Design a protein around this ligand. Structure first.
Ligand code: NA
Lengths: 139, 132
């Protein structure tokens, strides 16, 4: 069952990253829809972008809540802090979309991409660490 | 065997993360073209293409290795929904090359709906994989 917990942790992480990138795919494609005049579809993509990032944040919190050992807990709290940066950048992108402003969009698009780069690396390190811990249990 | 399940998990997870990043990149590049960052846009498009190529290869590997009767049908579904997704993102890149906002809108729901199904299917495949 500690074996079971490692898998549940890996799954939180994998879903969190996937939904976080989906959230960015929705704000940028939503912005394009908006500029094409499809305001209702853009508004649903904004809401979807909100909901995806909020679900990722919640899984990251669960991931911290379940990280006991010192190796894991420190990487996990840095993922949590990095995600906050990412979430704030995407919220910035959603408001540029509501305000129809390319200028504000480009201003935070780069912030989002740099936090997202750190999130991917943190995920890889956590995946390796969790898989190491599961394998040491088996040994 | 247990070694093969870790390789299959890595393939599936990397495939889906690169696949969604491929769409986020072509949408970003489109927005860059709208604001005149044509050089910047071309870098996103190249990345979108490469990510699509790499994730397609990982999906294909995942499927070739998923011979078990328990996985066979789910792995084939993954491959077909992934095809539907990659064709939608290729449509986004073509709408970008054509600088067509309307064309882009029309393929957006194709890509987003398929990715929503890929996320679900991913969960079931790793459940089935974690069943050893
Ligand atoms: Na549009």
């Amino acid at each position: 069952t500690e074996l079971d917990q490692t898998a549940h942790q890996s799954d939180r992480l994998n879903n969190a990253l996937l939904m976080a990138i989906r959230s960015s795919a929705n704000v940028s494609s939503g912005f394009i829809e908006q500029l094409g005049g499809h305001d209702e579809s853009a508004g649903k993509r904004m809401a979807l972008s909100v909901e995806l990032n909020n679900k990722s944040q919640a899984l990251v919190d669960e991931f911290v809540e379940n990280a006991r050992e010192p190796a894991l807990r420190g990487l996990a709290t840095e993922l949590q802090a990095t995600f906050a940066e990412y979430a704030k950048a995407v919220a910035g992108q959603r408001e540029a979309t509501r305000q129809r402003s390319l200028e504000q969009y480009f201003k935070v698009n780069s912030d989002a991409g740099n936090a997202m780069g750190r999130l991917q690396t943190l995920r890889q390190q956590l995946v390796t660490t969790l898989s190491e811990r599961g394998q040491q249990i088996m040994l």
